[PDB]
Each structure stands twice: as structure tokens, then as C-alpha cells.
Symmetry: C5
Subunit: 324 residues, 5 copies
């Protein structure tokens, strides 16, 4: 089978997240069955058998599937939209290398500082929404050591009077630097200057969207409803799926497997369907299937410095192609 080979995986798998909840389920199933074997008196085992036939009546797999399928679809839709809001600088680096001009050191100062300002504004929003980025940069000093912010840029950064998140501050620095480069003629076209500000606002909106998703999550009332629905089912199966003794002649309880194999396969299904939504509710951590942000941060700074510095005005000479 195609998807059949995938269930033998462990890296970010279903068994890596649920293996613990199973033995807390199966262990409680055996501890509640071994009482019915040994220590439970004969009159109260008769009471237990009526309690098992009560709980299996109210154990309905149908409604839980509805609250899982509509809750999960909502979570995976929000999770994919958070990835599209990732601050990428490849669109800004094409406008900068075509609109900013100069082979001298001041031209290279402009192109590298503009691309560092976008990269700094992505570091600042990602250390606020990702714990994997936050342990790389615990303090703003860590951002000065990494090269994204200079100490001169740090003094005026820390002297702005704002109680709010200052990720927008290098975006304003970008607009002051591009207006200076348009004033000094480094930007030959006024329409080119308009394109730089158009593309920076597209970049700044993506940094703003990551703050929006991080602040307004899925409602807690709706996360709690799906969770008590899934665990009201597993308590309706911790009693209602108990193997009663066949000497009592209860109908559809005629074997003593001492292993709820089909109940455990429902637990893999139901608690694993819930586990999809628990891993995508906060996709910016250090888990193995979280968004690889630290590797992404290195890229939008390595490929943007590569593009506006060595690849500025460095073209091969115009050859006639093979199909001329």
C-alpha cells in the first residue's frame, strides 16, 4: 500500500504523540478489569455489569466525529495560512537590486541595509511568535551579536517610547532610507520608488499577520468542547467495553479477550484525530513537524545579501541561444 508504509514511521508520527496516552488508557482498563477478576465482591460485580451495559448505550462514535472533523478542518486551514504569512524577503530583494543603483560602497551600503532592515523586522516578529526563534535570540543583545541590528540602531530602538511590540520599527527605517536614496538619485525612477514602498507594505503586512494569528487563536471555548467530547467517549468506553463474564449470559458480552483491541484502535483513531489539532494549534515550536523557522531565517538573510551584493549588475554577456 501507498499510505501503508507510512504507519512504520516514528519521526513526528502518530505513535510518537499518543504512545503515552495509550498505556494510561490500557493500564486503567486492566486495573479496572482486574478488580472485576479478584477483589470485587459477587453482589457488586452484578452492579458493575449493569453499569457496563449502561455506558455502552451512551458511547456514540458519530457526534464526536462531527466535532473533530469541523474543528480539525478549521485548525488546518488556520495553520496553512500562518505559513503563508512567513516574512520572506525574496520579493523585496528583486526590487532592491533593480531600483537601487551604484557600484560604489554607498550603493552597496544602501542595498545591504535595506535588505537587513527587512530581515531584522522578520527576526523581531518571529522571536515574538516562535519559541524556536526566541531561544536563538533571548534578548535584543543576541540580535546585535547576530548582525541583524547594529549597536547604533539599538540605541534609538531602545529609546523609542512604546509599550507595544516594535517589530514595525525597521519597516519605518526602510521607508526613511528609500526616501533618502530617491532624494540622492540612487533610485532613477519615481515609479521604482513607488514599487519599493508597495513591496515593503506587502512584507510588513505579513509580519502583521503573524502577530494577528498569534494573538487571536482558535477560541478556547471551542477547544474545550471538542476535548470534553473526546474524553466523554473514552470514559464511556473505559466502562462500557469491559469484558463481563460469560457465565452471566449477558447478550453481546460473550468473550473474555482481556485486551480491548478494537477499543484501542478507536483510541488511535479518536485521540489521534485530536492530536492533529494539538500540533497545528501552535506550529512555531521545537517539535519535529513544526515550521523550520531558524533554517528559514538563515536563508532570507543569506540569499538576500547574495542577491543585492554579488549579483548586482553582474550579468553574462548576451549570447545567441541554441534556438536562435
Amino acid at each position: 500500500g501507498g499510505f501503508s508504509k507510512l504507519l512504520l514511521l516514528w519521526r513526528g508520527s502518530i505513535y510518537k504523540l499518543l504512545w503515552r496516552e495509550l498505556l494510561c488508557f490500557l493500564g486503567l482498563f486492566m486495573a479496572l478489569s482486574a478488580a472485576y477478576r479478584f477483589v470485587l465482591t459477587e453482589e457488586q460485580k452484578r452492579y458493575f455489569e449493569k453499569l457496563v451495559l449502561y455506558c455502552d448505550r451512551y458511547a456514540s462514535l458519530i457526534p464526536v466525529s462531527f466535532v473533530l472533523g469541523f474543528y480539525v478542518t478549521l485548525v488546518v486551514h488556520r495553520w496553512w495560512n500562518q505559513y503563508l504569512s512567513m516574512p520572506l524577503t525574496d520579493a523585496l530583494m528583486c526590487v532592491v537590486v533593480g531600483t537601487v543603483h551604484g557600484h560604489d560602497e554607498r550603493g552597496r551600503l544602501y542595498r545591504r541595509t535595506l535588505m537587513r532592515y527587512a530581515g531584522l523586522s522578520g527576526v523581531l516578529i518571529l522571536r515574538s511568535v516562535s519559541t524556536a526563534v526566541f531561544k536563538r535570540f533571548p534578548t535584543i543583545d543576541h540580535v546585535v551579536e547576530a548582525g541583524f541590528m547594529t549597536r547604533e540602531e539599538r540605541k534609538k530602538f531602545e529609546n523609542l517610547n512604546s509599550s507595544y511590540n516594535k517589530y514595525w520599527v525597521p519597516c519605518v527605517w526602510f521607508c526613511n532610507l528609500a526616501a533618502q536614496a530617491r532624494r540622492e538619485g540612487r533610485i532613477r525612477d519615481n515609479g521604482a520608488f513607488k514599487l519599493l514602498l508597495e513591496e515593503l507594505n506587502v512584507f510588513r503586512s505579513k509580519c502583521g499577520m503573524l502577530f494577528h494569528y498569534d494573538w487571536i487563536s482558535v477560541p478556547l471555548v471551542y477547544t474545550q468542547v471538542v476535548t470534553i467530547a473526546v474524553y466523554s467517549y473514552f470514559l464511556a468506553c473505559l466502562i462500557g467495553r469491559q469484558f463481563l463474564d460469560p457465565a452471566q449470559g449477558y447478550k453481546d458480552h460473550d468473550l473474555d479477550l482481556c485486551v480491548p483491541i478494537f477499543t484501542l484502535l478507536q483510541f488511535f483513531f479518536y485521540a489521534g484525530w485530536l492530536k492533529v489539532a494539538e500540533q497545528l494549534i501552535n506550529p512555531f515550536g521545537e517539535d519535529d513537524d513544526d515550521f523550520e523557522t531558524n533554517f528559514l531565517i538563515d536563508r532570507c538573510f543569506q540569499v538576500s545579501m547574495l542577491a543585492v551584493d554579488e549579483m548586482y549588475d553582474d550579468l553574462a554577456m548576451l549570447e545567441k541561444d541554441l534556438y536562435w
Copy 2:
């Protein structure tokens, strides 16, 4: 468990909204059971037992889940779209600091008034759609005291002859002020003036969208259908889940728990699934998981005045970075 720790929460939780409906359910369950204990005569308890076996037949959890899952998905989709229509001024503040120019007091008059005009137009739409903003500004005088509107701006505001909502009026003031700043050369580029009007219309459309969502809600006919579906179920369980006495030998009514634990866990599920849609149907109030508008209003005025006044034309000198 991951989501298991969340059910011990109270702040905007499921128990904070449903705790009252439970004791009006469980109290009516006990008052209807204690009649069957004591005061109900023996011939009419036989009538009661046939009424209980009638109501549990017509109590189907399936169809209610359909009208809840499709109604809730529609409400949470509309609720997230209302948050994206929030009037934010961070895109306008980057165009203003790069297109408007001047270190003198008239340049600072332009940049602060343009950003205050957008902020005033967001105050005006949010006091019409949010009760939390409306108690902060009960009157337009409250908007003059807060600094968003001057008394001179108030005279011509109140002398416009319009029976409709005047939130669009500072947006028209923006377009008159930007056309004046383009006439006096404060805006060096005509394409830059086009960018200001492009971004203001993006801002004005978001203020217009919050009015659209506030006027056209989810249809009342559809809210009433989901509500009578959920409460036709709980009356099919206020009778059909009554513990009849086991001396009558009725099938699948063989215990007298005197506590509808599984019926109460369905009430947590069903009435709590409905409670998701009741809190997101009007997300602009003073509840604890509503949109924090008052804190947002302070931000788009603190970070816009910070950006166009102190951060205008104030850049660190161009240093070679660590990876030069």
C-alpha cells in the same frame, strides 16, 4: 494530555458560559424525578413510563450535530473575517513617513494630521460596532477630549447634513489634506500621491467592511433553527433519560443513578457547541475573549504618532555590517 490541561481553565472557558444552564437542566431533571419518587400516583407513573420510552425514541444526537457543525463553521468564518477588517494604520504610516516631507513644523502638522484623520475614522467606525469602544466614547465630545477630533474639526463635522453614519468624513478630509500637500510640494512624487490615495482607500474599505458585517449578521431564521434543534433535543432528554424503577422490568432502564452523568456530558457537548456560536456572533463586546479593541485603538495612535514624528528622517549612519 495537551488539550487536557485546558479544561481546568475558567477565563473565558466553557464552564464560565454554561455553568448556569446546567443547574437549570439538572435542577429540572431532579424536580421531575422527585415527582416520580414521591407525589406521582401509581397509575400515572405507568403513564410516565410510557412517556419516557416515547421521548428516548425521538432523541437523535446525529441531525443536531449537522445543524451545529455547519452553523458554527459559518459563524467562525465570519468571525475571523471581522478581525481582518479591523482599521489598522500601520500601512498608511509607512507611506506618510516616506511620501510627506519637511523637518519644519508644517511638515509635522501634515504627518500628524493625516495619521490622526485615519485614527479618527477608526474611532468613529468602532464606536458604532463595538460596545466596548462605545462606553469609552459615549458622545462626540468624548472624542474631542481624547484628542482624535479638534473642536474646529467638530463644528464642520456636526454641520454636515447627513442622516447616515459619518465615519467616512475624516477619510474625505485625508484626501483634501493630501491634495493640498501635493500642491505645495510637500509630496515630491505624483506617484507617491497616488500611493497615499491607494492606501487610504484600503483603509476606508476596512472601515466599510466592519459596518457591512455589523449590519448584515447571520440570518435570524438560521439562528432560530439551530436553537430550536438543540433545545428540542434537551426536552427529548429531560423526559426520555429519566431513571424508571427496575421493578417494572423495562428494558434498558435497569439502574436508578439519580444523576444523568452521560446526559450532562451531552449537555456540555451540545449546549457548549452552541455557545461557541453565541460568543462569536458579536465579537466586539466586553467579554474576556472578545476582540481587545480599546488596547488596539491606543496602539494605532501611539505607534502612528511615534512613526511619523520622531522616526521621520532619523536614521543611523550607514555602517558596514558583520558580513560585508
Copy 3:
């Protein structure tokens, strides 16, 4: 309860639309039961009792919920998209007041005629898609009396040779008038002229979208499938939910309530879920929860004439704000 107070409403409610279908259901239920009381012979009442146990077998609430939940979600998605295509002129009125110039009467002629051309093009599309707008303007003469079209504009309107809907004609008049105002220098910026034509095409596309939704509705084959599914159920309950006499000892027919209360609550649920889709299939009529178009038409003409005439170049003098 939150949604519990709403079921006591009548204005555009569920009872306002279904109250008639109930007595045609409950009246046919009683007329079919009173035959079983009185006029039906004893041998053919035995035939009736086997017919009731046949129809309640094939009465499944599940599949109908599927064809209602997926049909309704599709209708409410199309209904909300029709409201976003409403021709609003607030975006055009900000570009006109900033790009068109002149304090003389010819400047005011330009600004009022351009905004009237957009408003006329919205009147023309809304009288073709809304019956509430069509009774306000039954003829094009009614549009000349209301001020949206002049008699001079009427002569060339009626002399164009086109068998198709002429709502696009004031949009072409807009582009001829703006090109004339750019030729005479009333529009100082060529980029400003580009912004006027960009925003008019956004306006003209919304008028074009209202024609698209009005022409291509939900497929009739799919409306008929959901309707015969809902009424195959109610005929499976007009027989299968009949109270047979308990002297015959038929199982799960042991009471004679003479009032299908739970069947009537399913009718409120099912026929009311269908009624959501019947009211949003054509949201432009005179019903109480239809789109208030006549009030909207008055607004986009009152607030556009207010904005380009009295508010043109009329700003308060630049005061230092409270937080200078």
C-alpha cells in the same frame, strides 16, 4: 439563554415563514388520524397499521441533514458574496475629490456628474436584479424624475442600438468625462487619471458581478433534489408517525397522544432548515431580512454629493494636537 431569547421574535423569524406549512401538516395529520378513529373499517385499519410500520422504517433523518447542510452552506456562501458586490461609490468619491480640481462651477459640474454617473450605473443594475428597486423605478422616466439621469442623457441612452442591458453605459460616460477633465487640466496628475479609471473598473466589476449572480443561480436540479428529499421525509412521517391503538399491541406504538409534538419539532427543524435557503436564494426583494437596497441607494447618492461638493477643499486650519 443567549439564543433562547431570539425564538420569541416574529420579525423575519422562523414562525413568520413556516406557521402556514405547520397547519397544512398538522391538519393533514389529524384528518388522517380521525379516519383511523371513526370511518376506517376494522379490517382496513389492520392494513393501515402495517402501512405505518412500513413508513417509519424508511423515514431516516440522517441523509436529509446531509443534503440540507451542504445545500444551505452553498446558498449562504453565495448570498454573502452577492452583498459584497453591491455597487458602492465611497471609493470613487475619495478619488474624485482628490484628483478632480476647481472651485468654480465647471469643477463642481465635473465632480457631481462623475459621481452621478456611478450612481446611475448602480440604479440601472439594481433595478434589473432587485424587485424592491424595480417598483421604485418601473421605467427609465422614473430615473429621470429622480435626478439620476437627465433628459439629454436619456435621448442618447435610448438611441443606442443594443438588445442587452445598458447598465454599463454610464460607466463609459465616466471614462469620456474623466478623459475630458484630464485634457483640460482639471486633473493635475496623469497617475491621478489612472487611479480614476482603476477605481471605476472596480466599481463596474461589482455591477457586473450582480448581473452574474442574478443570471447564474444555484442549479435548479440541485434545488429540486433537496426539496424532494425533505418532502419524501414528511410523507414518511405523515404515515409512519401515526398513533396506532395500543389494543393491537404493536411494539413502540403504545400511546395515543393525538399530537405529533416530536414530529412537529422535526418539522420546525427540517422545513425551517430548508427555509433558510429559500429566503437567501433571492435576497433582493421586499421581505424584511432582504438586503435594504432602497435605503442603500439613497446613501451612496447623499454621501457622494456631500463629499465632492461641500467637502471639496474645505479643511479646518492645521492645529497642533493634544499630544504634540
Copy 4:
């Protein structure tokens, strides 16, 4: 009822598409029942009765509704998106009448040829994706007779060396003609020339989208799964819903109606729910509820020639309106 009047329709109705499948179902039901009446021996009628109680066990209406509701929602979403990709020229005709200039014959040559180039490119894509357009233009000669392509335009059209669909060729002709009209000063603004190329690419993308939908349909594997699911059900009802004789005393088979009325109403429901997806899988044919393309083709050529020729620079003189 509102939707109740619609089931008496025939034009593109449910009965117009399913009436044939019913008599092939009901005829096979009677031919399989009349064997059980007459020709089937007494020992093998006992075998037939065990086969009927086998097939009605495995006839589940629930799962089929899931594969129909999720398959149909996907088809109607793709069907509505194909209609929005229809090549309409009303946006191009407003830019052409405002940007292209001249009252002489060369100005009218420009405006009519540019609008014919867009209309030709829509004819070429629609004869490749619509069978109703293909029978109107079986050959490119049919396009020369209709006026969309000249014979001079045909020579270079047929001499391009390309094995692929050449619908993009009049879009390239548009860009060469607009660049010529900008070179000769017919286009006064360079920003106006940018607007023409911006709007043509919006037009060319819609022609490209109709090719994309026509090439990548719904997957055949998924169409086959929904089809074998619906017809595995009707064979589980061609046996499992047979009226066995009541002399054998089989439970819940106690009548001999000789007319599967409730089975036929399920066939109207299920096979009709499938028929929604069969008609919207290819919406460009000659069926009565297909997209009226031939009438649309006549419109975008009649209203575009009307708009750029008679309505070019032909405005009523500027009158003061009624509310001056």
C-alpha cells in the same frame, strides 16, 4: 411552499435527466419480482428470501451521502469558478475608450481593432472548451466569415509554427497594436499605456484559466468512486427491498405493495444528487442549464463595438442636476 412549486418544472429539471434511469430501475424491479411470483420454484424462493434479508443489511444510505455531499460541493465550487473565468471585454472597453484617442478614421481603426483582438481571443478559447461554440465555428474559416478575424490576420495566424493552442496570439497582437498607438501619440499618457497592458493580462489570464479547468478536470478516480458507491446501493436495494410473501412470516416484510415507492423516492434523491455533479462537470455544452456562451459571445462584441465607436467622446453637455 416556496421550493414546492419548482418540482412541477421540466426545463432542465430533475425529471428531465432521471426519468430514463427510473424505468430501467423500476422495470428491473418488476422483472425480478414477477419471477418470484410465477417462474421461481418453491425451494429456490426460500433461497431468494434469504438473499433479500442479506442485501438489506448491507444497504446503508449514510456513507453514500458523505461521498455525494463532499464530491458535489467540490464540483459546484469548480463549476462556479469556471463561470468567473469567462472572457468578458467590458473592463478593456472602458480603458480603450478613455486611453486611445482620435475622432478620425485611424483612431476608430485603433479602438475597433483592439476590441476585436480581445473578442477574437475569447472566440478562440471558447471554441476549444465549449461544444456549443465549436459547432458555431467548426473551422477558422468560420471565424473569418463572422468578422472576428480578417483574411490578412488569418495568413500570419496559420503560418506561426506552433503545435499548441493559439488563443494567446490575438493577445500578443493587442500588445503590438497598443505599443504602436503609444508611439504615434494616440495614447497621451504612459500610465494609460500601462493600464491597457494591465487589463489585457487580466483578460488573458481568464482565457488561460478556462484552458486550465478544461484540461485538469475533477480526478477520474474520484468520479468512479462516487459512481460505484451510488450503484452499489441501488443493487443492494434491487434485491434487499423485494416484497417477500407474508405467508413466510419474515419480520419487517409483511406487505406486498408491488411498487417500491420509498425505494423510488430514494432513487430520486440519490441518483438525482449524483445528476447535479454530472451536469456541472462540463458546463459548456448545448444542455438547457449550461452556460449560455453563444449569447455571451454576441454581447461582448456588440457592446464593445458600441462603446468604443459611437460612445467615444460623445457626452451630453454638463447640466446642473436636480439637487444642485
Copy 5:
């Protein structure tokens, strides 16, 4: 029937993908039944019969349909969005033929190199996400032999210091080449140069989106949950649908067909519904219903070289049309 003719297909059909899983199901069904015929002892056949009545209780088709319908809808939505991210150059080829100018060889060098740079950047992203493109170009030398990259362009391509995917490198070459053509006057309009960079970033974002979908797939935890749900069902039917002998008198096991025809039709339904998601999870391979990328790569290079070279400035002379 309409969809009835499609089940006789083999090319990319349901039987082409599932025919193997059926005989591994039906073969295991017969091998487990022939034990019950012959080799299983009489006391342990009694144990087998209680095991069959245990497994058919826990075989529920309902919940599996929920995890298939919501998983498949998510996969087909992501699959159609990957096709819209395909790097097509038809929008860039219309801007290049209208903005780049010159009938000499340097003008043709510009137009062909700019269109080859976009086509090279599409080859580079498609050999990273498609195995069908990767076997056409196993090495970058294969890209030099095909004409997309010159050897001179290869030297500086391979000498850039980057550990990441270099598909963005011809997009940066485009922006350097267009800025050179604007400097030398080949691009007459500065707004035209802005349009080239606007359209290249639209192209570069589509190449970036194909990398995003290829890196972030559907979560493996959710693929594993749907797979163990579908195969927990088929093991609940490999036991629970076994034909027990009718001499034991077990209820609803009264025939010995020795062919699980209805169980095999559920396998066609369920395992085939899963097979839809296995083929669209990676749509870029060599299977018959995968995206035809190699044919698409040939087109965007054949029709772009055709459009900017032979069709540059080559128009028919302006004739009066048939409806002048």
C-alpha cells in the same frame, strides 16, 4: 447513464490503482474461510463464530466516511492550488513584447534572454518538485544541453555560495537585465519598467509557492490517522463478514455465498476513496493523471520565443472590419 460509461475505463482509473489490494483482501478472505471449512477443529470453530459476531459489532462505516471526506476535501483543495502555482510565462511575454523595443539583434537578444530567464527559473523549480522533470534534467549540464542555461550563465551560477535552492537566481538576472534595458533606452517608459518588475514578482511568487507546497505537505499524523481508520475497518470485515455455517443457527448469518460481494463493493468504495488522496498528495510524478509538466515546459518556451521574436512589431495593416 452519464457517469456509468466511465467505470469501463482503465487509463488512470480506480481499478488500475486498487486491483492489487482486492486480491490481497479477497485472497485473505478465502484463506481464512477455507480454514473454517477444513482444518479448523469443531470446538474452535465455535470460538471462531463468537469472534465473527464480535468483529461485525465494531465495524462502523459511518466514522471512516467522516475522516475520509474531510481528509480528501483538504487534499483536493491543496492539489488544485498546486496547479495554479505552475510557472507560466504568458503574462511576462506580453509585457516583454510591448515594453522591450528594437528590431535589431540587441533588441532580440533582450527579448529572448528575458523570456529564457523566466523559463530557466521554471525549469529549476520544477526539477526540484517533479520527478518527471527531474529525470529529464538529472544534472545542471542537462539544462545547458537543452538551451535554458548557457555555459557562461553556468559558471557564475555554480560559483554562487549558497547551500539553498538556486531557482531564484534567474529571477535576479531578469531584474539586472531589465534595469540595463531601461538604462539604454530599450524600455521607453519608466512605468513600463515598473510593469516588468511587477509581473516578474508574480512569476517568482508562483515558483516560490511550488517550493512551499513541496516542503509543507499534509501532516503525516493526519495521513496516518485516516489510514489506520480505513484499515481498522477492513480487519473488522475480514473477520466480521465471514460466512458462518447455517447449521449453528446464528442470526443474520444464514447463507454461505463464499464471495463477500457487498464487502468487496465496500472495499471499492472505502479503499478507493482513500486512493483519491494518495494520487493527489504528490501530483508531479510519472503517473497518467499527474500534472503533464514536461509538455507544459515545452509550451512556455515554444510560445514565449514565438511571441517575442517573430510576433514583435509584426501586425497586419489596419483594415475596416465587417461591421464598420
